[PDB]
Each structure stands twice: as C-alpha cells, then as structure tokens.
Amino acid sequence: VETFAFQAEIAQLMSLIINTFYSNKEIFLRELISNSSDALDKIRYESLTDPSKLDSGKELHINLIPNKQDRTLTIVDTGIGMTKADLINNLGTIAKSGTKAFMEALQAGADISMIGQFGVGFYSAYLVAEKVTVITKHNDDEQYAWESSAGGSFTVRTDTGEPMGRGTKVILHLKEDQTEYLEERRIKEIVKKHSQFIGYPITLFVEK
Ligand SMILES: Nc1nc(Cl)cc(-c2cc(OCCN3CCOCC3)c(Cl)cc2Cl)n1
C-alpha cells in the first residue's frame, strides 16, 4: 500500500462536503451514475476507431448493488477505467482547478447540488459515505484499488479482488444514518427522479 496526501484544496472540499449541513444528500447517486455514463461514453468512442478495446467485455452498462450486511452501496460500470496515473492524479491532485472553480461559485450563489458542473461530483459520495473504495481496471494497466476515509490522505494498492474485465466500481461504506440508500424503493426513486434518461442500462440488484 502507498499513502498519498490530497492536494490542499481537494482536502478543503472534502471537509466541506463532510461537515456542511445539507439535507439533500441523494444527489450523490446522480453524480456517480453520471461519472459512470461518461466513462462508458469514452470506451464506446475509443472502440469505433479501434474494436480491440471491447476485447475485455463488449457490454456497456451500470449495476447498482446494495448490501445491507456490509452496509455498502456499490455503483459498477464497464466503462474505460483508470490506469495507476489517472487514479492518483485525477482523484488527488488534478481536481484542484475544479474545486477552486466550485468553492469560488458556492460563495457566489451556488448550492452543493451543483458540484458536478465543476467536475468534482465524485466527492459528493462523502455526503453519505464515511469511506469510499474505488476499484478500477484499464485495458492499458492492471487492476487497482484506491481508498480514502478523508482526513487529508488516500491509499493506492494493487487489486487482489476478483478481476472485473474493464471498468470501475465505487464502493460506498455508508454512514450510520444513511442506510435508506440500501433500500430498493429508495434507490428506484432516486434513479427515476435523477437518472431516468441515461443511455446505458441501469440494473438495480435485489438482495438475498
Ligand atoms: N465511474 C468512473 N469511471 C471512471 Cl473511468 C472515472 C471515474 C471518476 C472520475 C473522477 O473525476 C472525473 C473528472 N475529473 C478527471 C480529472 O481529474 C479531476 C476530475 C473522479 Cl474525481 C473519480 C472517479 Cl472514480 N468514475
């Protein structure tokens, strides 16, 4: 396991999302679902001008896997995925510009639900999650697991867990009081209301 520090502005954003009073937390699902859709758009394209990219799985989709036992909600996509570099730089250093653009817009009329407009929508996961684990596999690199419970740092290690083919799974280890996001009808409700017209199939797994 390697340990890295969040660039100071990214750390300030995460303390903000984690510590600000905002009751409309359900937007986090919309924001993960959009990120997934974007990454699937990206492998779709890269496969037109190259059909070998789908050698790692031709199905382009999004699965929603709640788990009451583990108290996790996992969003999985068969999108482009991230290489070691994307994972490290994106998540922990390069969101610097967007966070500034976002925090600069909050103290200027914006509200938290506008986070994705500045490309930092991933961090809205900290509204319901105490820990986020990201599993990713890029055609060009091996499988990685990124993790953070905030606190100014994150970890990157090689993923021992089952291979996924190509894609990303964001595992949200929910806060004690947000278990309603492990509920079929509640997930169904947020998707219908927020992600109704996503161009890839969204499957909500059932428990047991
Ligand atoms: N589902 C999914 N798939 C991929 Cl390939 C990436 C991500 C993802 C994207 C993120 O940010 C994208 C926008 N910017 C990219 C450059 O770095 C700043 C952010 C983030 Cl932050 C996290 C994930 Cl998991 N999620």
Domain boundaries, the chain: 1-208
Ligand 1, CB within 6 Å, residue ranges:
35-36, 39, 77, 79-82, 90-91, 94-95, 119, 122, 134, 168, 170
By most ligand atoms within 8 Å of CB, the mutation choice from 30, 31, 82, 195 for ligand 1 is 82
Distances (CA, A) of 4 to 17, 24, 171, 197: 20, 31, 20, 37
Q: How many CB atoms lie within 10 A of CB 130?
A: 15
Centre of ligand 1 from the C-alpha of residue 122, in Å: 7
3-state secondary structure of 153: strand
DSSP character string of 70-116: TTEEEEEE-S----HHHHHHIIIIITHHHHHHHHHHHTTT--GGGGG
Centre of ligand 1 from the C-alpha of residue 35, in Å: 6
Torsion region of 144: left, alpha or beta (phi above 0 gives left; psi -120 to 50 gives alpha): beta
Centre of ligand 1 from the C-alpha of residue 117, in Å: 13
CATH superfamily of 1-208: Histidine kinase-like ATPase, C-terminal domain (3.30.565.10)
Distances (CA, A) of 84 to 3, 110, 113, 145, 208: 13, 33, 29, 9, 34
Centre of ligand 1 from the C-alpha of residue 6, in Å: 15
Phi, psi values for residue 10, rounded to 5°:
-65, -40
Centre of ligand 1 from the C-alpha of residue 208, in Å: 31
Q: Round to whole Å and give the CA distance between 61 and 11.
A: 31
3-state secondary structure of 189: helix
By most ligand atoms within 8 Å of CB, the mutation choice from 56, 122, 126, 135 for ligand 1 is 122
Pair 39, 80: CB distance under 8 Å: yes
Pair 182, 68: CB distance under 8 Å: yes
Resolution in A, one decimal? 2.2
41 is annotated as contributing to ligand binding: no
Q: Round to whole Å and give the CA distance between 188 and 208.
A: 17
Measured by CA distance, the residue closest to atom 17 of ligand 1 is: 90
8-19 and 96-106 helices, crossing angle to 10°? 50
